[PDB]
Amino acid sequence: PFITVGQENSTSIDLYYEDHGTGQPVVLIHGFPLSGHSWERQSAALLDAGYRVITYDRRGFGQSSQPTTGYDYDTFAADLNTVLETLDLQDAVLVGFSTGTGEVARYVSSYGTARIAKVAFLASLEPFLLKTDDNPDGAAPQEFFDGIVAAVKADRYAFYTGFFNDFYNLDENLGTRISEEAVRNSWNTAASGGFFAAAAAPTTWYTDFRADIPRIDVPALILHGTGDRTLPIENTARVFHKALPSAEYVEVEGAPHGLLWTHAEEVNTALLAFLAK
Amino acid sequence: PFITVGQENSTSIDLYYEDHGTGQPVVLIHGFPLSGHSWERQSAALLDAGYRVITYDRRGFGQSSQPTTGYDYDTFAADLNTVLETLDLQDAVLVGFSTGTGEVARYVSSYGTARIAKVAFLASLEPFLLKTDDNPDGAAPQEFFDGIVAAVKADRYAFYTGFFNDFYNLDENLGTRISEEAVRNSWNTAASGGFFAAAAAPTTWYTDFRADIPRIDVPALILHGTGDRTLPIENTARVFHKALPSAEYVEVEGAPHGLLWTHAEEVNTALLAFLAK
Amino acid sequence: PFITVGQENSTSIDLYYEDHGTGQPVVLIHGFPLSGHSWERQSAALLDAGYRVITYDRRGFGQSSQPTTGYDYDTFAADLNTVLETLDLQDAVLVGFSTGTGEVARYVSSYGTARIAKVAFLASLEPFLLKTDDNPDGAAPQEFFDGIVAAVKADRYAFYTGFFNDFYNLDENLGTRISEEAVRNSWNTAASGGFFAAAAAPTTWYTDFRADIPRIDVPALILHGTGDRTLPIENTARVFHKALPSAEYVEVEGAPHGLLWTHAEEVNTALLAFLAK
Ligand SMILES: [Cl-]
Ligand SMILES: [Cl-]
Ligand SMILES: [Cl-]
């Protein structure tokens, strides 16, 4: 199913989405370079617990349109606002994962929380990944991000194999917490995304969200794996926990970035406890 | 192309279908966990023989919508009735394979045969797979089916590799009657189906069709491989042949469940003989 | 996004297309058995240089409909005419690759060049691949083409692995100019195309375009790799260069048929020089 969020030349920009179940709406927002189907272990647990689960594919990924425009978090937050206004959701829960946590913060800051009950940040990028003089807790300098763009442009297909080795910590988890076949599914999903979004999305990951975080005025959850090699915990959740001390804060020791699959039981327990509160 | 069969929350439930050729309509219904494209060796032979071939992807599979509702044979038969009424088919032939043979029997029993010339059951599940006191010919107890649901929920992607080894009898047929690349295609098609249908469909396979079978009042074909490890012939076609002795009955010695590919010549010969009669 | 080009029984024949950028329109037409996404290394360079890039999937391939009718170059040229008339393109550049160069010549000959600024033929099939008495420069006799049809019908999935070994010259280029993952993407794209188009398209490759070539009355580029094992250069571009001596003519020594990937820098340099002229 599709929601139209914009236009590019002669074509509409349509996001693929799904809407399942009955109950309070929970909107699940994926990250690079996957799709809404990557939430399947959480969607099954939320449907059995009595929630309505909405997932969509961000622009440039999954089954959504693949424009060459609008790769910035303000546009990703506008796309989320169109999804929530078109479905007319109230008392919704926004749950972001990985790089999809950028539009959760930017939506709250720009559009406010009238439709929102709670927000959750899983393996998040906040508050500001770029290491600069005024941000010593950043993870890396600009050259690191330019390097990821040059590797995607050189051969995105081979890039995804090295990316998923560090996303799931395959040297530790292949064969035990993730199978070869689930990794193959993730590679197929990345290869179906748009070529232009794959090389443009890395330029958004050094957006500064420090001014957005104090605008969060609803209950929040911050969850992160301490073995994350993609978004290191010392530069992301441990700094975010100091900026937003009201949030529930959960560290999953040893988990990688791709913990929605590898550590699904621990993620589901923490999400269900936060949703019931 | 799509036919709408229902609605789920804000979305429509749409089935992907194709409509090719000129002649008497033959509707081909696949089984778990494939799609209408799995009939390609039969569709090519039926098109060369002068038939119109309609294939569709059942709800939850292939390119169709992926709802979390309606996984029962009465709904699958309602979806088939919507396809036949929307296309306004007359004198049609219904050909089911594998678990898609359940809605062929349930459609005939609920809706009757005014639009139907003939029906065919290939590698079928009838009459009632569950072994109970009143059904000693059933294949297995309830716990077997619950086990398949728990294995799909644990990791559907790795489940499909073991499933296809027994679906095609790969220890006998890999390299001779089926290539590694055709198996890879089947895994890709299973992984594109919906996560909720994959774990829900196994709970429909122990439906009792014994009261539906005496309502079949048109010519019928029953075909099965004697090497089927998925739906064993002693619990399915040999018992169905006693319940419906009017049907043409064809055993293909040594063929597995996935015989539309591995034994396409023998299936096509038997289908073309039955269609011309 | 989709453009409707025809109807087959109850369904429309829709071609998937994309429309990116701002500038003079450049329409990129792929060949067998890929899709418009195979132009990604050229589309990125044309977008950075200031052109509007339109790509579409030919009937039977990629994300387009999969009819069982209309596999001939006059219909493929009609589909291109519908794309150009629906988008109302003017001063457009048509760039064909591989077997998609047949509809570029047939469009110009049948419909004329009022909408067209320039045309380009990359790894092309012209002027007439069939070796006959009146065409001694043809590549092969009829039996060669019938053989490719019989190999696709026997098992298209395994056919694509041997096809891509000669399309990319993998014995020379695997690991250096093309990765295993980019080859896997190309196999996935071929397997998503329609089964009927895969076996029908080979019967179009021996169409005679000798009467179409003198109707080209706009600037043209002819580019080909001298290591092409799919469409040999001695039977195609070197004969076309004598038939159309006005065209710019570029040989890329040692490049295979799949040179849009393996030799993207040399293709992009020659395309950008021809577009600026
Ligand atoms: Cl992203
Ligand atoms: Cl099923
Ligand atoms: Cl072709």
Distance separating alpha carbons of residues B244 and B262, to the nearest angstrom: 27
Helix H or strand E encompassing A183: helix A180-192
Helix H or strand E encompassing A204: none
**Does residue C158 contact residue C238 with C-beta atoms inside 8 Å?**
no
User: Of A110, A194, B243, A270, which is closest to residue C16 (Cα–Cα)?
Assistant: A194
**Does residue C36 contact residue C96 with C-beta atoms inside 8 Å?**
no
Helix H or strand E encompassing C41: helix C40-48
Q: Could you tell me the end-to-end alpha-carbon distance of chain C, in angstroms, rounded to an integer? A: 32
Scan for tokens 């594998």, then name that residue. B98
Helix H or strand E encompassing B100: none
With vertex at residue A40, the alpha carbon angle to CA B258 and CA B185, rounded to the nearest 5 degrees, is 30
Q: Which ligand sits nearest to residue C207's alpha carbon?
A: 3
Please give the distance of CA A80 from its chain centroid, rounded to a whole number.
12
CB distance A44–B153 less than 8 Å?
yes
- Contact list, C187 vs chain B (CB under 8 Å): 181
Q: How far is the CA of B198 from the centre of ligand 2 (A)?
A: 8
CA atoms within 13 A on the CB side of C192: 22
Using CA coordinates, name the residue in chain B closest to C9: B19
Sequence-distant (6+) residues with CB within 8 A of A123 are A31, A97, A98, A101, A223, A224, A225, A228, A230, A231, A257, A259
What are the b/e assignments for A154-193, b being 16+ CB within 10 Å? ebbbbbbbebbeebbbbeebeeebbbebbbbbbbbbbbbb
The contact set of C with B (CB < 8 A) is 8-12, 65-68, 153, 155, 157-158, 160-161, 187-188, 191, 195-196, 199
Distance separating alpha carbons of residues C118 and C173, to the nearest angstrom: 32
CATH number assigned to the domain comprising residue A80: 3.40.50.1820
With vertex at residue C255, the alpha carbon angle to CA C249 and CA C256, rounded to the nearest 5 degrees, is 110
Q: How far is the CA of A228 from the centre of ligand 1 (A)?
A: 17
CB distance C20–A68 less than 8 Å?
yes
Give the pairing of strands C52-56 and C11-20: antiparallel
Distance separating alpha carbons of residues B104 and B119, to the nearest angstrom: 8
Site from A179, A192, A261 to mutate, B interface, most B CB atoms within 10 angstroms: A179
Among C20, C21, C181, the residue with its CB nearest the CB of A157 is C181
| Residues of C labelled as active-site residues | 98, 228, 257
Distance separating alpha carbons of residues C76 and C29, to the nearest angstrom: 11
- Contact list, C158 vs chain B (CB under 8 Å): 179-182
* Shortest alpha-carbon distance between residue A105 and chain B (Å): 26
Q: Which chains touch B (3 or more CB pairs under 8 A)?
A: A, C
CB distance A181–B161 less than 8 Å?
yes
**Does residue C1 contact residue C18 with C-beta atoms inside 8 Å?**
yes
* Domain range for A113: 1-277
CB distance B155–A179 less than 8 Å?
yes
CB distance A11–C1 less than 8 Å?
yes
- Contact list, A44 vs chain B (CB under 8 Å): 153, 195-196, 199
Q: How far is the CA of B205 from the centre of ligand 2 (A)?
A: 7
What are the b/e assignments for C236-253, b being 16+ CB within 10 Å? bbbbbbeebeebbbbebe
CB distance C182–A65 less than 8 Å?
no
Q: How far is the CA of B248 from the centre of ligand 3 (A)?
A: 42
User: Of B131, B108, B110, which is closest to residue B121 (Cα–Cα)?
Assistant: B108
Give the pairing of strands A52-56 and B220-225: unpaired
User: Of A29, A122, B48, A205, which is closest to residue C68 (Cα–Cα)?
Assistant: B48
Scan for tokens 């003989």, then name that residue. B273
Distance separating alpha carbons of residues A251 and A255, to the nearest angstrom: 9
Q: Which ligand sits nearest to residue C152's alpha carbon?
A: 3
Structure-solving method: X-ray
CB distance B47–C196 less than 8 Å?
yes
Q: How far is the CA of C185 from the centre of ligand 3 (A)?
A: 19
Distance separating alpha carbons of residues B160 and A123, to the nearest angstrom: 29
User: Residue B22 CB: number of other CB atoms within 10 A?
Assistant: 11
**Does residue A222 contact residue A124 with C-beta atoms inside 8 Å?**
yes
Give the pairing of strands A11-20 and A2-8: antiparallel
Q: Domains in chain B: how many in total? A: 1
Distance separating alpha carbons of residues B99 and B42, to the nearest angstrom: 18
Helix H or strand E encompassing C66: none
Query: Is residue B235 classed as helix, strand or coil in its secondary structure?
Result: helix
Q: Which ligand sits nearest to residue B76's alpha carbon?
A: 2
Distance separating alpha carbons of residues B197 and B205, to the nearest angstrom: 13
User: Of C36, C34, C32, C28, which is closest to residue C203 (Cα–Cα)?
Assistant: C32
What order do you get walking across the sheet with B52-56 strand by strand?
B2-8, B11-20, B52-56, B25-29, B92-97, B116-122, B220-225, B248-252
Q: How far is the CA of B239 from the centre of ligand 1 (A)?
A: 56
User: Residue A90 CB: number of other CB atoms within 10 A?
Assistant: 12
Among C17, C43, C179, the residue with its CB nearest the CB of A157 is C179
Is the four-CA dihedral A127, A131, A134, A136 of positive or negative sign?
A: positive
User: Of A7, C55, C194, which is closest to residue B44 (Cα–Cα)?
Assistant: C194
With vertex at residue A69, the alpha carbon angle to CA A68 and CA A70, rounded to the nearest 5 degrees, is 140
Distance separating alpha carbons of residues A225 and A229, to the nearest angstrom: 9
**Does residue C89 contact residue C190 with C-beta atoms inside 8 Å?**
no
Query: Is residue C6 classed as helix, strand or coil in its secondary structure?
Result: strand
Is the four-CA dihedral B106, B109, B111, B113 of positive or negative sign?
A: positive
Among A68, A160, A187, the residue with its CB nearest the CB of C47 is A68
- Contact list, B87 vs chain C (CB under 8 Å): 10
Residue A98 annotated to the active site: yes
User: Residue C181 CB: number of other CB atoms within 10 A?
Assistant: 16
CB distance C195–B19 less than 8 Å?
no
Distance separating alpha carbons of residues A20 and A43, to the nearest angstrom: 9
User: What is each CA distance from B183 to A55, B163, B166, in whole angstroms?
Assistant: 30, 11, 12
Q: Which chains touch C (3 or more CB pairs under 8 A)?
A: A, B
CB distance A9–C52 less than 8 Å?
yes
Q: How far is the CA of A32 from the centre of ligand 1 (A)?
A: 4
User: Of A39, A92, A91, which is closest to residue A62 (Cα–Cα)?
Assistant: A39
DSSP A95-128: EEEGGGHHHHHHHHHHH-STTEEEEEEES---S-
Sequence-distant (6+) residues with CB within 8 A of C247 are C121, C219, C220, C221, C222, C240, C241
Query: Is residue B95 classed as helix, strand or coil in its secondary structure?
Result: strand
DSSP C113-129: STTEEEEEEES---S--
**Tokens encoding B85:** 């009424």
User: What is each CA distance from A33 to A36, A80, A95, C191, in whole angstroms?
Assistant: 11, 17, 17, 23
Q: How far is the CA of C100 from the centre of ligand 3 (A)?
A: 6
Q: Which one of the listed residues B98, B109, B124, B186 is annotated catalytic?
A: B98
Using CA coordinates, name the residue in chain C closest to B86: C10
Site from A5, A10, A16, A59 to mutate, C interface, most C CB atoms within 10 angstroms: A10
Distance separating alpha carbons of residues C42 and C23, to the nearest angstrom: 15
Query: Is residue B276 classed as helix, strand or coil in its secondary structure?
Result: helix
What order do you get walking across the sheet with C92-97 strand by strand?
C2-8, C11-20, C52-56, C25-29, C92-97, C116-122, C220-225, C248-252
Rg for chain A (alpha carbons), in Å? 17
Site from B8, B64, B65, B157 to mutate, A interface, most A CB atoms within 10 angstroms: B157
Residue A228 annotated to the active site: yes
